[PDB]
Write a protein that binds this DNA or RNA. Structure first.
Length: 51
DNA sequence: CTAAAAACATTCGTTCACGTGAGTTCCAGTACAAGTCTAGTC
DNA sequence: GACTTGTACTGGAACTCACGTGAACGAATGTTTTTAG
């Protein structure tokens, strides 16, 4: 359902960060593995900065 | 009348200036430890 | 106890990066008004 021609701005890269929350890496890896297996992208609401 | 030359209006891209949040690191400022405190005789 | 010298730690500011907002100029196109043939 993700159309290639539906491009707005350059894409970014999201990587796990264990410095702040301990155990986030395991959940991130599991989510990545299962998304790859099931070929599904996670829909999210993004708020880069306050206000 | 007629077309054409000039003027006017619009949208886009690039440039710049300013403001602001986030990450990195460099340094002034602070804290703390150690030494000094006069020179000589008997 | 007061001064001086030397060493170690540390939070704030400088720098950079990236994004958003607003203002200005020129290119290219389209459209309207006016004037000579």
């Amino acid at each position: 359902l993700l159309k290639k021609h539906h491009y707005l701005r350059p894409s970014l890269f999201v990587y796990p960060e264990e410095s702040l929350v301990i155990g986030s890496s395991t959940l991130f890896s599991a989510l990545l593995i299962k998304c790859l297996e099931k070929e599904v992208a996670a829909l999210c609401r993004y708020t880069p900065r306050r206000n």
